[PDB]
Amino acid sequence: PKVSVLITVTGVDQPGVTATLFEVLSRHGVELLNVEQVVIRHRLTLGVLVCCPADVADGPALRHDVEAAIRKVGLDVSIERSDDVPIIREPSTHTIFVLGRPITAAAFGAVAREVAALGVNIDLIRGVSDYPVIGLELRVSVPPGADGALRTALNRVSSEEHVDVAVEDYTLERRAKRLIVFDVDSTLVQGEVIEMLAAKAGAEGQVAAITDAAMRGELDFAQSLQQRVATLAGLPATVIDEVAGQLELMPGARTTLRTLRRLGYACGVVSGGFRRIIEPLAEELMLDYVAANELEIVDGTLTGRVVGPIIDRAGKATALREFAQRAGVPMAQTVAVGDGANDIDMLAAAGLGIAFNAKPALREVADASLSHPYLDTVLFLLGVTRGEIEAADAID
Template structure:
């Protein structure tokens, strides 16, 4: 692969993406749009951070099925009060350059989406605040004001992330050749492979090896170097 700058490597935009610019950019949330893993932040409140961090790391390296890992991690959250979501949202830190990247994409007429293996309860209000156009994430089940330790509905895994990229591109009338997907974990590889330009962002080795391009600094503005 050809290095395009000290901050990035791989193949920069080409074809329709280079000629007409991006029409849709889709990012992962945890460790991409934001600095942290929300499941680990929730687990800290449940006293299960170490166990959850270990399972998260294995899942992101592609060593275990993402859906199975999610159910295992979510089970540790049973009994937490719903008020924990507001506490975690207040602690979330955006990755440097996140707001600038979103603003620049919108300036270019590009739509922006976030598809997350994390949770609607945190991702949706964050996306709303940032003016993000599309959002998909998991939803945690609650009963009587407390988490049950289960997920409601489908799990946003590798397959669903790719499906959402394609669905949003169709809704926005954007050719897949003009889409960009950015993520850090093995569950992002489907959308990274399907996009016109797939970008591994400070990613696990398995993702860097398979992604057409990679960003090596924790600054989302570096994605612009590839465009």
């Protein structure tokens, strides 16, 4: 067939429109180049690009056949000779997630304006969750070299409008993520294990102050760890088992892990904490990899020391590279989730660094930040919808 024709059907959705159009088209010489159809809120759009011999596109016969069929049932149709028209649209360059509880119109409006301001086209918008937060995705096409300006603008928008806003490369490679590590304390697990241990010794107050100082980046991590663990000197070592039994997962953790397993992820934890507490929990969640420091115990008593070497800021990033090497995963396809300045290097090395209810120091270097206390909002940044999670869990 010689020449191209574009047929576009719009109106209120009704059963059978799709089959009726192509059945009609088949009476003429029609081969398909492209078909695009969606229904949004009972509004149907059906765009069909065809090629027919220049011995039928000329013709009123095709036009009359289509127009009568479509108009009679109450929809509209346009029919145009194209030839200057793309067959298939290009892929989006980036995707943008907007999360909030609530997402105001003012906030989403602020996002749309910053996007428009940079010459960025919105290729699509859809919802990805209604729970535990509202989530929206926009797939966009960013002009070459505007990506940094875009992230900057949206970070300002996120801070002023009280929504989480994440910009991600939407290219084939950098969205085939296959490996994730979680920081434990205040990320996978609620609270700080070291503070729970210090409480037994009656030093919770001092240890929490040092902890907060360290997690904000104000303190050297290694020195901070030495000072805090020293506070435990003389405790019976069963304090470890106690604290282990007291641990509560971050809300959404079980959903997060369970969903990441479905997707074939390798899952691990990297922690400055203590392996006698972490490894036990890790086994129960059936994780793949654990890096943790180590408490010194003499005669069933904590000495107040940690066994070197110390997992420090650089150490966490090293554990990730290690994990990815043993896993066969390129750094670009890795994810890291953390909350403290302790996690800064690890997030840096990751293909996707996610800051979860994080200190300002971590948010400043993270690829994305989550501000709501639901760990499963991580899944939304990984291209999963609430609907898919619920569906998967229904089939058991």
